Design a protein around this ligand. Sequence first.
Ligand SMILES: CC(=O)N[C@@H]1[C@@H](O)[C@H](F)[C@@](OP(=O)(O)OC[C@H]2O[C@@H](n3ccc(N)nc3=O)[C@H](O)[C@@H]2O)(C(=O)O)O[C@H]1[C@H](O)[C@H](O)CO
Length: 376
Amino acid sequence: MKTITLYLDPASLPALNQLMDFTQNNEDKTHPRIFGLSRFKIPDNIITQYQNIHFVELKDNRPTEALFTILDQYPGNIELNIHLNIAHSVQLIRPILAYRFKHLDRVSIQQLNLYDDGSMEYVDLEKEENKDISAEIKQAEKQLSHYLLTGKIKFDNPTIARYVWQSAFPVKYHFLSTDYFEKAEFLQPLKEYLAENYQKMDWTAYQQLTPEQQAFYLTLVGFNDEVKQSLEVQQAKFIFTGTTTWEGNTDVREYYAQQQLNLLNHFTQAEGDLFIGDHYKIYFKGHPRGGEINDYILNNAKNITNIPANISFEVLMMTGLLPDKVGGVASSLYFSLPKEKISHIIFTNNPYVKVMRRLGIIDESQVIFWDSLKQL
Ligand SMILES: CC(=O)N[C@@H]1[C@@H](O)[C@H](F)[C@@](OP(=O)(O)OC[C@H]2O[C@@H](n3ccc(N)nc3=O)[C@H](O)[C@@H]2O)(C(=O)O)O[C@H]1[C@H](O)[C@H](O)CO
């Protein structure tokens, strides 16, 4: 009997937690591990320390067929310890379930650990506000059972379906906001159902690691001393946080890049609507997937210090390097930021606005959408 651990995430936040799990378990050099993290490359000098370490690409939010070649290397009874993105959990587990069908006598699911993609889970839940949640949960359990028995996916409520894994497997959920599940009264049946199966993402995990494990983790997440030193300057600091669009259309991507530059100018220029003051040093923390939208900022702004886009904002919180003020387009990073550090959050009944309002992240003041800002 052998456990294999799979770490799967096409996004950022689940991967950040899963890389913490790997760090906590890093003394075990031979435990089989399969990494399917789209946004993170494990350094070669770390890979070389481990045996039975494997890598799999994700395509259309699932591990490719290459997963099967890896699993075939382990011919005995295997129990899978699976770490997944909540929003994409149904797709990410699909090929795992297909493999289990083919090898029903030797392959089992030990447990699931699930982590929020980010704001999407909350915006999606907010849209379920008028439904009978208790009834939705019962139907989703039934349809999950059909998926597990047939390998076919058909959910009447794809959103609620993300939360009924306990009906089939031992599970632990790690939520960006546990407050949401208490504050949203319509979700009371879901909070009750989830019972003892969830906790908040633990941003204090890093502080509990050993000095060696702390250094290891920082290497996993792309943090380096140069970035550290940039953020240790003796001057008040403002970090402008970027966003992205998933659209490929050039007109849309160009519009996003232009509007975001205009938004930056509204924070940093004396005549801007959101003017922060002249005494701040300005940094740019671009979206990990901003691409040429990030480039547009660096090419067109001045006196701005880049923080490499691949570095998740939450690492600054972990390392004690948060700035005085943070501002930009609504992002999951705002869910874990001390409220005193928010300058302004800008949006592109709006369900995202509703989520942030429920959580006390934004106040009762009229929300600012970026198309309401004068072109400076
Ligand atoms: C509603 C919806 O669709 N929310 C999804 C969200 O669940 C998903 F997870 C992600 O989350 P998103 O909120 O962009 O941010 C997720 C994480 O990325 C890192 N980050 C982001 C921006 C930045 N300037 N510096 C950073 O470091 C932080 O670790 C943060 O917590 C995502 O793909 O990661 O993208 C958003 C949006 O699709 C996207 O914002 C475009 O509107």
